[model samples]
Target: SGFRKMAFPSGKVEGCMVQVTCGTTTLNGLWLDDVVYCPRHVICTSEDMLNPNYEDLLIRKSNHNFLVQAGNVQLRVIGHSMQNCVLKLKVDTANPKTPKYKFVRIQPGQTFSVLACYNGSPSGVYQCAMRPNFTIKGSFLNGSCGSVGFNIDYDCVSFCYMHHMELPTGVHAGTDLEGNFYGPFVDRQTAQAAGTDTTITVNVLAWLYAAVINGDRWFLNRFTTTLNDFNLVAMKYNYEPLTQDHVDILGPLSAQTGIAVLDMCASLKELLQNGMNGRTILGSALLEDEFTPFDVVRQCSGVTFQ
Candidate 1:
């Protein structure tokens, strides 16, 4: 993991010196050959301390004859200063290991990945010993002054970043480029008035079911006919999002004007409830958040029937 020198609450913690207080100290720096170099304060009283500059850290061969390029590659680099020690992954193992497969020197301050590796991996067992050909030693305590170790493992292919199809500048999200929806999931004209009403009813039922199952009585009261309907409890999540798995069924039905009918009905209700059916109800019985069910509907149901 990263260096665990000491915590500094304000400028300096209880037992350890803050990083840079006076800016006039050259405390011992941890150096692990070409792998890592950590700088710890000497005086413990200064505020202008220079945090470790990991940008110059490098890596050399640890001791291990790994089958490079066979699979994902992982490396363990450890270092220590007089103040403390750190053992963690400087390189990811879930990447293709090739002759081009070499140990990657991680940036010094980038310690999150290192700590995560220490607590969540096969442990530092193989990282420290083994690997006859893989051994990493640094110049800590000598130059800037710190010590470190290396653990090298190969065949971790999913960890490396490779260039694939370049994404265009604006292609950030879903297929909907502009990111707003006003239409239905399918056909509109065919549903007309009656089909619209049915679709809206189905939508309201969907919302009501969602609220009941999720134990959100607040939502049910706001969307349903009465609070008692929630207690009836015959609800089920019978529908799934329109996905490739159901493209065969939802595709045609929605395309043949089913989706548009649903949309039209939803839009009309939206107009009535939001634009025409003002908030003043015959008698109120729900929360403000639950009051509007047919307000704004977005068509995110993806490509479908027809």
Candidate 2:
């Protein structure tokens, strides 16, 4: 490796993420010590992998906007009004319960990369607000404490079966493909060229179905709650909508859900448009791992998707 010994499986490494940091002062700035450090990342526009073909790339359209694919290749991102921003990588030692974040600064026109140095790693997401001080741009205020918020609940699904080679036999083939809801068998037969065994099966549909419903609950929570009680309370900050680009990131989940993301957004937006409030949704059982929140409301709440 480099000159010094680095943290191994325990120390800073991949699986961490680049997250949105909300704050105003150095107190809120990223502290490496407090962070769960994993080292290094890649900073480039073009990377050529011989195998892993046709992969999806996350592209930042603007400070608040994001997308899936982009140009032939220029870089991970850039830092200009119309360009990608520089990413100052660090760790989030704050929310221990939440997923670990390799913090990235929201500097308007700054561009940086971390994965290049390390063989590989992960970049990181979220909601809510800062409990105390908040800063945006470079401006600082005393007790005003500014604001931080999100309109759409954004998240990603990182599957466990991707690296199943190290696992027991049937684990991988279990969640293989759709064979009349018996995906394990169908995919096993297909992948094995009409051969193979009775592997440990996980219904990929059902598992990611869990993911889709979880995501629906996230949007349900967002639509039902107020953005106050945190830092920024203006109720007006950045406007982020669910775009096809966002759905594209979900891979096949949208197909599995039988509803595209935009319709789902409209469904929740309809609730907000109507009389749906925070307590009503929060107090209720909320959607379980059953189906979309809108689907639940449609069933019991006497409502329908718009």
Candidate 3:
């Protein structure tokens, strides 16, 4: 059997899902994504095209009928009428139990933009609808519900999604956003008070160096006070091995001391070059990374630095 080839075809959603009637006037969808939708009903196209005409058709009916666009953590609305209208933007970040809401008023012929944080949360998918008179609750955006709906799906990467790299072996510690301590204790007194295997002090200089690099001035400032305390301890001990009683008080570094240890070789070298001093050198060992201040300390017991 023989067959004939067919021609190309194209189609699209012709018009808006719903039209609203306010008093004597009516509102219809004229455009979607900045293109003519109900183009037959639009007026003075050539004259009004250059102007902000998104809500022009609706405004010609009643200023109360408007358009809304919702995005991740943000909302935008266009008012067509002569009066102001309040829009209720709802955000569903896939957490239905904790939906976010923000209300913004748009003056006629104007567009208003606001962040979802206004509703106390700023996360994902935002869909909005008109408040329908300001006191009653509203639903998510959709045309079947007798509402003009707008939505924006925002793909986001939160802080929790980054920086899970494993740190090296050492007592690493830091405070959280609320300034609470975590990991390896971040202090000596508390570690001693807790007693028994709690004393491998968390040296924070390496972390502090990174904090400075990362622009966490608050963290760096907080660590500064702790740094002074640690410096005094190092000075008092002359960087010598801790006394049995002190080590006992300081506890031991066993399996429980797993923490983030920021590499401080560079900082240690800088300190040494600045004339800081520390313990007796047991033997000479080549540092694989960089020559650090610890190099000079390793040259004790009659070994020369040549």
Candidate 4:
């Protein structure tokens, strides 16, 4: 039995993943490692392939077919075979050079798959090449990496929230009400998008407390002026109604201590409102994933008395 081979096969990978960092301290920040996707392929380094089309670029054959893996970047080629290949990686979409065919040499029987690794250059189309047996050429192009699809849940509740930031800092994409949720020129859409009942509960509580506590004497005198407004929102969220029993017992305690019960309620309300904003005297909350402590507390931190 004999096997015949023809004009060989080929492919290309094209995509870029953005890295998002979070935190002020350089030593401690989070980074969104995978965020980009690879859909099409283009011949890179093409001399006239300026703004070359990526629609028909080659890609690794996956599972012996062209089926794409759920949300992944690297193309999957099922085979215990390795071979030297060529790559045409382009940097800018508008300009391409002669397709590069690096003489990549694959071992006799390496069970590993092949992928173009773009260390991080810019944006452009990427293409790859492979021969039956030979050495790959060129030092591998800049933007020749591919990516898959995926969704992330920046869950940040489990960790004893850094009342500060993490060390070995960098950018990240998680939700936290601490230092990460501060404000300057915030996007109304992003803010609105980030605003969820689950994300705002603890934020609301912490914020409300700050508004009422005032932190220092300078903020006290103004507190009286905003009491009515605070009570209204408090009633809406039912923060006080749920804690009424505690309020009842605290009445005598407050009376003897000369603390205003109504003011206590007002303070709680202000903090609750602040939670809605996800800010406080110290900072904002930054969640690392889809879940948050605020959500946990909201689901089980109360009882509706009959």
Candidate 5:
């Protein structure tokens, strides 16, 4: 628990400075060197703002020894005993027989996350304890417990860029050589509304395929070997560029092929959204603002690209 400072909407105090302007008005009193005060600001020195309630929460070693967040359980060791500890957590602690998930050697400023569901199993009520050293028995740390669960309507996409074994020269300087993964969890309808549809899919894949072929001759050569046999036949027949008649027949066929690829992408997205079909692990940085089910999976699995 923590103290929440609430401001009075309308009140006249005997000692405090009063202001009478509406929405956007400026007033100031006792301006410090660099501190700018708001119109209805409550100014107080460090000692003046101290209260038993707020002071307790402010003191790191008082009660809170850890910071735990749910919805993708994130645990951070804090306070005086923060460093040199191993945080062990048991997700779905409703089952006592479940093995504890150990976070070994958690130092100060270090934080970790656990996925809400693993293989379709919800992480209900995470119970955690910390061990400070090798010989000492583990002790349960305060503020080290939480719950985590899944998002109802969410979709995840997993993609990776590889140089077919090695990195292309200039590509590394311009692009991230490490990892670039994202999972924008949204409903199928929302995703489709955002242009994750047939046209965009065709457009995206076409550009990507072109980039790969143009970037590396080794990659292009490997794929063109199968086309070589067909090219030999065309050479023997003295084939020329496609005529309008040939274009008329091939254009619709190419469009149909793109549409099929689009359908396949939709199918893959659907399969990822289905829990029973597969267990999807999302990366941490993808859900940077707040924790998500994907973060839980990545953090726990040690698959974080960070």
Candidate 6:
């Protein structure tokens, strides 16, 4: 639940001043203490450590326990400076209350499991804060400054996989990686519109439900063997790639994919002037930023099935 900062659109957004190497293109770095100081900047990219650096190399400004990790300091032992540099480091050894994070330097592509659980069924979402860990297998292939993306290492997790499934009324669902979707909830009728009668609504809901499940399966399909990635969602997030509106609208699902299908299930209230699926249609009919009966499914019916 922190204000997410990015390198681009460096307007009044007020980002931390991180240093990077004076290179032709994007500079490489590693996670030290919680930030990744690069060349032009120093090598302070914090991959394993959360908050300070976004997984894709963006810098996190605040909302950390030690607070000092997400610092915006200048180069000392690192490198030279350049234009528009980004702040980028980890560790509490003396005070046990202060978490001691490892110095992990890896490719920006490296994964680390970090998420706050909802602590309930898919129907009744949102809850406690716990940063579950995931292990990093690749050697120090993740290089440091100058020798970027090679010969560096990562420090990251072990936890049971968790998947949530919410289905439409009459859809035939399949087994995902966790096998929780063999059978599920019944989606009821959405509000009737000029073009959205009962049959159309049913068909839309059916396909959308299948798409949501398929999206989940596709994620597991790749994750199970392809990549043991660090991925999960929380009620509030500090993602960089996503703009504020997408997060406000899609909630947890915005961090990933299937925004349209998730839109139908998650039941967004704040409608854009022209949202997906002629979304403004419901806005015209309903008030208080809420639309059709789908909200009922998201907030009411879906929980009972679990």
What's the C-alpha lDDT at position 105 in model 1? Answer: 32
Q: Which candidate number maximizes TM-score?
A: 2
RMSD of 2: 23.4
* Candidate lDDT (C-alpha), each: 0.21, 0.23, 0.23, 0.25, 0.21, 0.23
RMSD of each: 23.2, 23.4, 25.2, 22.8, 24.6, 21.8
Top lDDT hit: 4
lDDT of 4 by residue, 13-86 (tens): 12222211111101111112111122122122333133433223233322233222222323232321111111
lDDT for each residue of candidate 1 in 1-306, tens digit (9 for 90 to 100)? 111112111111011111111123322211112222222222222232223322222122232311111112223333222212121212223222121122333211111011111111211111111011111111112112111122122221111110011112211110011111112211111221111111113333333323333343322111222222321221222211222322332233345333332332233233334442333211222211111122111112222211
Candidate 6 per-residue lDDT over residues 138-179, each given as its tens digit? 111112212111110111111111222112232111111121
Model 6: weakest 10-residue lDDT segment is 4-13
- Which regions in candidate 4 have their CA more than 4 angstroms from the true location? 1-201, 207-217, 220-231, 234-265, 268-306
Q: Write the per-residue lDDT of candidate 3 for residues 89-164, one digit (tens) a residue.
A: 1222222221122212221111111111211122122221111111111222211111221211122111100000
Instruction: Report RMSD for candidate 5.
Output: 24.6
Per-prediction backbone clash count: 68, 26, 2, 77, 2, 41
> How do all models score by TM-score?
0.16, 0.23, 0.15, 0.21, 0.15, 0.17
Give Cα distance to truth, residue 42, candidate 3, Å.
26
- Worst 10-residue lDDT window for candidate 1 reads 157-166
Give the poorly placed runs of model 6, Cα more than 4 Å off: 1-17, 26-74, 78-306
Candidate 1, lDDT over the whole model:
0.21
Q: What TM-score does candidate 5 get on C-alpha atoms?
A: 0.15
Let me know the TM-score candidate 6 reaches against the reference structure.
Answer: 0.17
Candidate 5, residues 1-306, lDDT tens digits: the string is 111111111111111111111122212111111111111111112343233232332242321322222223332322221111111222221322212121123211111222222211232222111111101111212111111111111221111110110012111100001211111211111111111111112222232222222231111221121233433433343322223333343334335334333232233233223422322112111101122222223332344221
Give residue 232's lDDT in candidate 3 (0 to 100). Answer: 51
On TM-score, who's better, 4 or 5? 4
